[PDB]
């Protein structure tokens, strides 16, 4: 395999064809799909890790959309990246304005 | 024809104990796609600027620095650089 030689979980082979058929360039490099696969897996790991630890404190062993929402919207760097996108049935972080309290 | 099986593998590495619902799986699957095209388009647009017909690791790396905020871009580059260097030998 190639992804196993890359020490990655994400398929470098599948990603390599996508840069071809996706019409991004005439010639796509050999290291390019490997590099991109490492970035995608990292961010995926970054979200899942933050989601799971946020899921275990909620006493649940299965990650549901609310957990993903809580993970992303509570990390400065992550929230800025996914600012424009809205997670389906994720709800919103519990926030109450200051001047609305007795 | 998705990344469903791969996200699960990554999940078990960072968290072998916990699992993930099918709805949330779709969300993460849409995520890696929205991350893929976002970087791919930027890399393609980057090479077009320099009149280059080839997307390489250099384009992907520069694309990361443009998209990823700050503290995330650094580690993303490192994670990417390490991978390429693995594919130089083995």
């Amino acid at each position: 395999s190639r992804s196993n030689r890359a020490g990655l979980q994400f398929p470098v082979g599948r990603i390599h064809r996508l840069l071809r058929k996706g019409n991004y360039a005439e010639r796509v490099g050999a290291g390019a799909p490997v590099y991109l696969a490492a970035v995608m897996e990292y961010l995926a790991a970054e979200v899942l890790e933050l989601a799971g630890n946020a899921a275990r404190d909620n006493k649940k062993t299965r990650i549901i959309p609310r957990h993903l929402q809580l993970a992303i919207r509570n990390d400065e760097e992550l929230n800025k990246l996914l600012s424009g996108v809205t997670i389906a049935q994720g709800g919103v972080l519990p926030n109450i304005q200051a001047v609305l309290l007795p | 024809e998705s990344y469903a099986i791969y996200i699960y593998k990554v999940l078990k590495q960072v968290h072998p104990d916990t699992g993930i619902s099918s709805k949330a799986m779709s969300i993460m699957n849409s995520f890696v796609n929205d991350i893929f095209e976002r970087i791919a388009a930027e890399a393609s647009r980057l090479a077009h600027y320099n009149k280059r017909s080839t997307i390489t690791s250099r384009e992907i790396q520069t694309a990361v620095r443009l998209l990823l905020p700050g503290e995330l871009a650094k580690h993303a580059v490192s994670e990417g650089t390490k991978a390429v260097t693995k594919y130089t030998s083995s």
Partner: peptide, 5 residues
């Protein structure tokens, strides 16, 4: 290992 709680 970034900024976190």
């Amino acid at each position: 290992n970034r900024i976190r709680l």
